[PDB]
Design an enzyme around this catalytic site. Structure first.
Site, PDB file in Angstrom:
ATOM      1  CG  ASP A   7      -1.885   1.104   1.280  1.00 38.37           C
ATOM      2  OD1 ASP A   7      -1.548   2.299   1.030  1.00 38.37           O
ATOM      3  OD2 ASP A   7      -3.046   0.777   1.590  1.00 38.37           O
ATOM      4  CG  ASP A 105      -2.933   3.568  -2.810  1.00 41.60           C
ATOM      5  OD1 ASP A 105      -3.959   3.059  -3.230  1.00 41.60           O
ATOM      6  OD2 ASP A 105      -2.745   3.922  -1.649  1.00 41.60           O
ATOM      7  CD  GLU A 106      -5.322  -0.374  -1.100  1.00 43.24           C
ATOM      8  OE1 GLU A 106      -5.972  -1.435  -1.226  1.00 43.24           O
ATOM      9  OE2 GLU A 106      -5.678   0.547  -0.343  1.00 43.24           O
TER      10      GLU A 106
END
Ligand SMILES: Nc1nc2c(ncn2[C@H]2CC[C@@H](COP(=O)(O)OP(=O)(O)OP(=O)(O)O)O2)c(=O)[nH]1
Ligand SMILES: [Ca+2]
Ligand SMILES: [Mg+2]
Ligand SMILES: [Mg+2]
Ligand SMILES: [Mg+2]
Length: 341
Positions: A7, A105-106
């Site tokens: 993350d 973003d993961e």
DNA sequence: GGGGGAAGGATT
DNA sequence: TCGAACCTCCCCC
């Protein structure tokens, strides 16, 4: 199964830091300005310096300015963050062919075939963190556990710039101890429906009548929660393909006038088509957000791909349909395309 | 009884 | 106060 979840920290604000290092140390607030009044809009994200004081995603820019009038306020540059994100995901593919990119973003990595235990997994985590810091200068938080859900929970516990392992014994403990509201997919509305049925921890779902649970949160979420409580949650890391692309814009003023809404709808189509970069959709949905923030939508699926011209004419027909079937004024209007060839 | 598709809801 | 992208009523077999 050993899962390694990555993350990226305060992504949008961090990328702006990497592009302007003088911002470092300063509260940085990335905003989505709507165009409706001086500083109308919301905070998309903020770094830690800003979050320390209450400035976080979701609050209006105007309120953030009352708390931190001297913070640096930057407009969203999604395309730049998307390019930097794509390069970090390419770095993660080197550590596993089984990779699930869940958002900008993961990403989850199934590293069962790369490590034997959690000690080796924790080291692989430091290595990925070092590799991303080295190549792009971005800090990320790593979460490791036996399934995707607990891997994420680990990352939520360890952020920012952290790395955490939730072993089998800790998984069993969290099943008894973790506030169920902190379990992915359980938001305010579901958390409240569960506080009402008495459920406050995962283990409480095993003792309640199933149809009582199902009747309140639905069959999939009841099954989900129970599977997690039974320590039987089984969801494989799967390659994710973008299934839909779209754009919704806020208008200067609320309206129901077709000719007045049209240029916004057309711009949303233009932006959506630029984004579709080579994907041809077979379905289009016109999406309106009414003055009281409700979402109304009408779509159409064609047996063929939609050309921009067919998107323009069909969207008007779908917008007319929205105006006809709903009397409220529209505040935001847009389109969504899907069912790619 | 239950596929399967359109629209609304919840989440992140 | 912004905005992009899996689950929960009716036709039809
Ligand atoms: N535009 C907008 N974006 C949001 C909002 N909440 C979060 N985001 C952005 C931040 C990055 C992305 C992933 O969101 P998550 O809720 O998983 O939060 P996160 O991982 O803490 O985000 P961040 O990296 O900014 O902390 O979506 C919001 O209210 N508005
Ligand atoms: Ca993040
Ligand atoms: Mg995240
Ligand atoms: Mg964060
Ligand atoms: Mg929650």
């Amino acid at each position: 199964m050993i899962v390694l979840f990555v993350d990226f920290d305060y992504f949008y604000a961090q990328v702006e830091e990497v592009l302007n290092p003088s911002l470092k140390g300063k509260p940085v607030v990335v905003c989505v300005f709507s165009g409706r009044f001086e500083d109308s809009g919301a905070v998309a994200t903020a770094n830690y310096e800003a979050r320390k004081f209450g400035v976080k995603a979701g609050i209006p820019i105007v309120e953030a300015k009352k708390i931190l009038p001297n913070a640096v306020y930057l407009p969203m540059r999604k395309e730049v963050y998307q390019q930097v994100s794509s390069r970090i995901m390419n770095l993660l593919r080197e550590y596993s062919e089984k990779i699930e990119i869940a958002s900008i973003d993961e990403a989850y990595l199934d590293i069962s075939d790369k490590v034997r235990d959690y000690r080796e997994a924790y080291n692989l985590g430091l290595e990925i963190k070092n590799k991303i810091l080295e190549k792009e200068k971005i800090t990320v938080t790593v979460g490791i556990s036996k399934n995707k859900v607990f891997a994420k929970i680990a990352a939520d516990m360890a952020k920012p710039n952290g790395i955490k392992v939730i072993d089998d014994e800790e998984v069993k403990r969290l099943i008894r101890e973790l506030d169920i509201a902190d379990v992915p997919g359980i938001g305010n509305i579901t958390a409240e429906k569960l506080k009402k049925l008495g459920i406050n921890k995962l283990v409480d779902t095993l003792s309640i009548e199933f149809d009582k649970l199902k009747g309140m949160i639905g069959e999939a979420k009841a099954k989900y929660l129970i599977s997690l409580a039974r320590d039987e949650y089984n969801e494989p890391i799967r390659t994710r393909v973008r299934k839909s692309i779209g754009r919704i814009v806020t208008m200067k003023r609320n309206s129901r006038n077709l000719e007045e809404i049209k240029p916004y709808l057309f711009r949303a189509i233009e932006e959506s088509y630029y984004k579709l970069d080579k994907r041809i959709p077979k379905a289009i949905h016109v999406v309106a957000v009414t003055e009281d923030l409700d979402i109304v939508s009408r779509g159409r699926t064609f047996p063929h791909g939609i050309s921009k011209e067919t998107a323009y004419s069909e969207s008007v027909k779908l917008l007319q349909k929205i105006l006809e079937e709903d009397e409220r004024k529209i505040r935001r209007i847009g389109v969504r395309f899907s069912k790619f060839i």
